[PDB]
Design an enzyme around this catalytic site. Structure first.
Site, PDB file in Angstrom:
ATOM      1  NE  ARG A 101      -1.521   5.243  -4.113  1.00 20.16           N
ATOM      2  CZ  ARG A 101      -1.056   4.089  -3.654  1.00 20.16           C
ATOM      3  NH1 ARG A 101      -0.111   3.427  -4.326  1.00 20.16           N
ATOM      4  NH2 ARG A 101      -1.522   3.584  -2.518  1.00 20.16           N
ATOM      5  CG  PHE A 111      21.818  24.686   0.946  1.00 17.04           C
ATOM      6  CD1 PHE A 111      23.146  24.577   1.354  1.00 17.04           C
ATOM      7  CD2 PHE A 111      21.247  23.624   0.259  1.00 17.04           C
ATOM      8  CE1 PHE A 111      23.891  23.409   1.092  1.00 17.04           C
ATOM      9  CE2 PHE A 111      21.995  22.461  -0.008  1.00 17.04           C
ATOM     10  CZ  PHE A 111      23.300  22.361   0.441  1.00 17.04           C
ATOM     11  CG  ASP A 157       8.356  16.291  -5.849  1.00 19.66           C
ATOM     12  OD1 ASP A 157       7.353  16.423  -5.116  1.00 19.66           O
ATOM     13  OD2 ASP A 157       8.969  15.204  -6.019  1.00 19.66           O
ATOM     14  CB  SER A 198      10.496  24.879  -4.312  1.00 19.43           C
ATOM     15  OG  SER A 198       9.539  23.836  -4.164  1.00 19.43           O
ATOM     16  CG  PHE A 199       8.400  26.133  -9.895  1.00 18.74           C
ATOM     17  CD1 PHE A 199       9.748  25.833 -10.043  1.00 18.74           C
ATOM     18  CD2 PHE A 199       7.939  27.360 -10.360  1.00 18.74           C
ATOM     19  CE1 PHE A 199      10.629  26.757 -10.609  1.00 18.74           C
ATOM     20  CE2 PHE A 199       8.827  28.294 -10.929  1.00 18.74           C
ATOM     21  CZ  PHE A 199      10.160  27.970 -11.075  1.00 18.74           C
ATOM     22  CG  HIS A 246       9.992  15.750   1.540  1.00 18.11           C
ATOM     23  ND1 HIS A 246       9.627  17.084   1.346  1.00 18.11           N
ATOM     24  CD2 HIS A 246       9.228  14.973   0.737  1.00 18.11           C
ATOM     25  CE1 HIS A 246       8.672  17.067   0.426  1.00 18.11           C
ATOM     26  NE2 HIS A 246       8.406  15.824   0.015  1.00 18.11           N
ATOM     27  CB  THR A 297      24.505  29.682   2.679  1.00 23.21           C
ATOM     28  OG1 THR A 297      25.638  30.042   1.879  1.00 23.21           O
ATOM     29  CG2 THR A 297      23.799  28.489   1.996  1.00 23.21           C
ATOM     30  N   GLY A 341       0.769  -1.237   0.000  1.00 24.28           N
ATOM     31  CA  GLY A 341       0.000   0.000   0.000  1.00 24.28           C
ATOM     32  C   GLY A 341       0.800   1.288   0.000  1.00 24.28           C
ATOM     33  CB  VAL A 345      22.668  26.663  -2.224  1.00 22.36           C
ATOM     34  CG1 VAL A 345      21.677  25.769  -2.984  1.00 22.36           C
ATOM     35  CG2 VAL A 345      23.967  25.892  -1.975  1.00 22.36           C
TER      36      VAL A 345
HETATM   37  C1  LIG Z   1      -1.050   7.398   5.576  1.00 24.72           C
HETATM   38  C2  LIG Z   1       0.131   7.998   6.306  1.00 24.72           C
HETATM   39  N1  LIG Z   1      -0.108   9.391   6.819  1.00 24.72           N
HETATM   40  C3  LIG Z   1       1.044   9.889   7.646  1.00 24.72           C
HETATM   41  C4  LIG Z   1       0.766  11.281   8.196  1.00 24.72           C
HETATM   42  C5  LIG Z   1       0.416  12.288   7.096  1.00 24.72           C
HETATM   43  C6  LIG Z   1      -0.760  11.736   6.285  1.00 24.72           C
HETATM   44  C7  LIG Z   1      -0.467  10.353   5.721  1.00 24.72           C
HETATM   45  C8  LIG Z   1       0.514  13.752   7.374  1.00 24.72           C
HETATM   46  C9  LIG Z   1       1.556  13.080   6.472  1.00 24.72           C
HETATM   47  C10 LIG Z   1       1.533  13.291   4.972  1.00 24.72           C
HETATM   48  O1  LIG Z   1       0.654  13.942   4.413  1.00 24.72           O
HETATM   49  N2  LIG Z   1       2.520  12.678   4.305  1.00 24.72           N
HETATM   50  C11 LIG Z   1       2.610  12.757   2.852  1.00 24.72           C
HETATM   51  C12 LIG Z   1       4.071  12.620   2.426  1.00 24.72           C
HETATM   52  C13 LIG Z   1       4.256  12.816   0.931  1.00 24.72           C
HETATM   53  C14 LIG Z   1       5.706  12.671   0.481  1.00 24.72           C
HETATM   54  C15 LIG Z   1       5.981  13.006  -0.986  1.00 24.72           C
HETATM   55  C16 LIG Z   1       7.429  12.680  -1.380  1.00 24.72           C
HETATM   56  C17 LIG Z   1       7.986  13.437  -2.596  1.00 24.72           C
HETATM   57  O2  LIG Z   1       7.933  14.833  -2.401  1.00 24.72           O
HETATM   58  O3  LIG Z   1       7.204  13.075  -3.706  1.00 24.72           O
HETATM   59  C18 LIG Z   1       9.476  13.129  -2.757  1.00 24.72           C
HETATM   60  C19 LIG Z   1       9.807  11.646  -2.976  1.00 24.72           C
HETATM   61  C20 LIG Z   1       1.777  11.665   2.247  1.00 24.72           C
HETATM   62  N3  LIG Z   1       0.959  11.852   1.231  1.00 24.72           N
HETATM   63  C21 LIG Z   1       0.421  10.612   0.983  1.00 24.72           C
HETATM   64  C22 LIG Z   1       0.931   9.668   1.852  1.00 24.72           C
HETATM   65  C23 LIG Z   1       0.640   8.235   2.015  1.00 24.72           C
HETATM   66  C24 LIG Z   1       1.461   7.503   2.842  1.00 24.72           C
HETATM   67  C25 LIG Z   1       1.234   6.121   3.030  1.00 24.72           C
HETATM   68  C26 LIG Z   1       2.073   5.290   3.816  1.00 24.72           C
HETATM   69  C27 LIG Z   1       1.798   3.948   3.948  1.00 24.72           C
HETATM   70  C28 LIG Z   1       0.699   3.386   3.305  1.00 24.72           C
HETATM   71  C29 LIG Z   1      -0.131   4.157   2.536  1.00 24.72           C
HETATM   72  C30 LIG Z   1       0.121   5.546   2.378  1.00 24.72           C
HETATM   73  N4  LIG Z   1      -0.694   6.275   1.558  1.00 24.72           N
HETATM   74  C31 LIG Z   1      -0.415   7.534   1.383  1.00 24.72           C
HETATM   75  O4  LIG Z   1      -1.151   8.237   0.505  1.00 24.72           O
HETATM   76  C32 LIG Z   1      -2.180   7.542  -0.199  1.00 24.72           C
HETATM   77  N5  LIG Z   1       1.791  10.367   2.649  1.00 24.72           N
HETATM   78 CA   LIG Z   2      19.678  29.637   0.098  1.00 26.00          CA
HETATM   79 CA   LIG Z   3       8.809  21.520  -5.722  1.00 25.31          CA
HETATM   80 ZN   LIG Z   4       6.445  14.811  -4.381  1.00 29.97          ZN
END
Ligand SMILES: CCN1CCC2(CC1)C[C@@H]2C(=O)N[C@@H](CCCCCC(O)(O)CC)c1ncc(-c2cc3ccccc3nc2OC)[nH]1
Ligand SMILES: [Ca+2]
Ligand SMILES: [Ca+2]
Ligand SMILES: [Zn+2]
Length: 368
Positions: free
Chosen positions: A264, A181, A170, A191-192, A135, A184, A21, A187
Site C-alpha cells: 500500500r 550508531f 524495508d 540499508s537498501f 525510525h 562508531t 485509516g 556497528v
Molecule cells: C497522512 C500523514 N502525513 C504526515 C506527514 C508526512 C506525510 C503523511 C510527511 C510524513 C510522511 O511521509 N510519513 C510517512 C511515514 C512512513 C513510515 C514507514 C514505517 C516503516 O519504515 O515501514 C517502518 C515501520 C508516511 N507515509 C504514508 C503515511 C500515512 C500516514 C497516515 C496516518 C494516519 C492516517 C492515514 C495515513 N496514511 C498514510 O499513507 C497513506 N505516512
Molecule cells: Ca556505524
Molecule cells: Ca531499508
Molecule cells: Zn517501511
C-alpha cells in the site's frame, strides 16, 4: 546445517490499533502467527512470550523525558500534553492510541529477549516480527515508530560482540538505527531503500558515517520498481563484501515487507521469494542472527512474507497451497503463499545498479 530458532510473540499484539485509516496494522503480526501455526512451523521452534520491557530498559537509548511521556500519555489525557506531543513528534504518523506504551513494551521486549538469548549462545536465530521499528529516535517518535527496539537489541548484543552488522531491507531508509550508531565502528549499518521524494528523505549514497564511524554506514538508494532479479544481484555481492571486510560476530536483519510488490505504501516489485532470498543469503554466513519485522502495509502479503521467512530460518519447505487458518479469506482469490510481481517498470536499470554497487565497493575498500 539446520539451526535452533527462537520466536517471540505476544497474543495481545494484534489488538493494538493505530486508528481508522492508519496503514500500520499490528493485526498483521497475529495473521503471520496464525498462518505459521497452521503450516505446523511451531513443531520446530522454541516459542517465547516477550516480557514487557521496562521504561528503564528503554532508557538505555531513549531519553528519560521521552520515555516518561510515552508511559504517561493516553487518548483521555492528550489535551494536557499538546506541548510534549509537538516536542516528541506524536501526531498523524505517530498517534496516541490505547495501550501505546504496552505495544512499545512488547515490540521491544521481543527484540531485547532475542538478543539476550543470542548472547547466551542458547539459539542460532531469534525472530521478533513485532520489532524492527527503525525510525524512532533518542527523543522523538517517527514514521509509526516510538521506541527503537533495534537500537536497544544492538546495545544488548554489543555487551558480548565487538562488531554487529545491521541490514535493513524495508523500503524506507533505516534512519533511526543509522543515526544511533553513526559515529562508531562497533556497528555497521547497511540499508537498501527507495530514495527520492520518499520518507524519511535520508539515506543518500554519500551518507557513509562520521568520525570513528566513517565507512561504517552503507546506503544503497533505489528507484521505483526494483524486482527480484535486480535486487538479488546486488544484495549477495554487497553483503558478501561487508562480511569479508567487517567480520561481524552477530547480525540483525530488519525484514520490512513494504519492499514487496503490491504494498500500500511501497513502490518496489519484489516477490516473497525475492525478499526471502535476503534471509537465505544472511543465514548462509552462520552467525548469531536476530530477524525483525518492520513495515508492510498490504497485510495478507506481510503474513505470507514473514511466514515464508520463518520457514527459511527453520530450513523447512512449506507448500504453496495455504493451509486453512483464522484469516483464510484474506488470502483470496488464490489462497497461495507466493505472489506474482506486477507489470510496473523497473526504473533501476542494470547499469544504475552496477554503478551504485561499484561506488559502495569503493567505500568498503576503505575499511581496515
Ligand atoms: C497522512 C500523514 N502525513 C504526515 C506527514 C508526512 C506525510 C503523511 C510527511 C510524513 C510522511 O511521509 N510519513 C510517512 C511515514 C512512513 C513510515 C514507514 C514505517 C516503516 O519504515 O515501514 C517502518 C515501520 C508516511 N507515509 C504514508 C503515511 C500515512 C500516514 C497516515 C496516518 C494516519 C492516517 C492515514 C495515513 N496514511 C498514510 O499513507 C497513506 N505516512
Ligand atoms: Ca556505524
Ligand atoms: Ca531499508
Ligand atoms: Zn517501511
Amino acid at each position: 546445517g539446520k539451526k535452533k530458532v527462537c520466536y517471540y510473540y505476544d497474543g495481545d499484539i494484534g489488538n493494538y490499533y493505530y486508528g481508522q485509516g492508519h496503514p500500520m496494522k499490528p493485526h498483521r503480526i497475529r495473521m503471520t502467527h496464525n498462518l505459521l501455526l497452521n503450516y505446523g512451523l511451531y513443531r520446530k521452534m522454541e516459542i517465547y512470550r516477550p516480557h514487557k520491557a521496562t521504561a528503564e530498559e528503554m532508557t538505555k537509548y531513549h531519553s528519560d523525558e521521552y520515555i516518561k511521556f510515552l508511559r504517561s500519555i493516553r487518548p483521555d489525557n492528550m489535551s494536557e500534553y499538546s506541548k510534549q506531543m509537538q516536542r516528541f513528534n506524536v501526531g498523524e504518523d505517530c498517534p496516541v492510541f490505547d495501550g501505546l506504551f504496552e505495544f512499545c513494551q512488547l515490540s521491544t521486549g521481543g527484540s531485547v529477549a532475542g538478543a539476550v538469548k543470542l548472547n547466551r549462545q542458547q539459539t542460532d536465530m531469534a525472530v521478533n516480527w513485532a520489532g524492527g521499528l527503525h525510525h524512532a529516535k533518542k527523543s522523538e517518535a517517527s514514521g509509526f515508530c516510538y521506541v527503537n527496539d533495534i537500537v536497544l537489541a544492538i546495545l544488548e548484543l554489543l555487551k558480548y560482540h565487538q562488531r554487529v552488522l545491521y541490514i535493513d531491507i524495508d523500503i524506507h531508509h533505516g534512519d533511526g538505527v543509522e543515526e544511533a550508531f553513526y559515529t562508531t565502528d562497533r556497528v555497521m549499518t547497511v540499508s537498501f531503500h527507495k530514495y527520492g521524494e520518499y520518507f524519511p528523505g535520508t539515506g543518500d549514497l554519500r551518507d557513509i558515517g562520521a568520525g570513528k564511524g566513517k565507512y561504517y554506514a552503507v546506503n544503497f538508494p533505489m528507484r521505483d520498481g526494483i524486482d527480484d532479479e535486480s535486487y538479488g544481484q546486488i544484495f549477495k555481492p554487497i553483503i558478501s563484501k561487508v562480511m569479508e571486510m567487517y567480520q561481524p560476530s552477530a547480525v540483525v536483519l530488519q525484514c520490512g515487507a513494504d519492499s514487496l510488490s503490491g504494498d500500500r505504501l511501497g513502490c518496489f516489485n519484489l516477490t516473497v521469494k525475492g525478499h526471502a532470498k535476503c534471509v537465505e543469503v544472511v543465514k548462509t554466513f552462520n552467525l548469531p542472527l536476530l530477524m525483525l519485522g518492520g513495515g508492510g502495509y498490504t497485510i495478507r502479503n506481510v503474513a505470507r512474507c514473514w511466514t515464508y521467512e520463518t520457514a527459511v530460518a527453520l530450513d523447512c519447505e512449506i507448500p504453496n497451497e495455504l493451509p486453512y487458518n483464522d484469516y483464510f479469506e484474506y488470502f483470496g482469490p488464490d489462497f497461495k503463499l507466493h505472489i506474482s510481481p506486477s507489470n510496473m517498470t523497473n526504473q533501476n536499470t542494470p547499469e544504475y545498479m552496477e554503478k551504485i554497487k561499484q561506488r559502495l565497493f569503493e567505500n568498503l575498500r576503505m575499511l581496515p
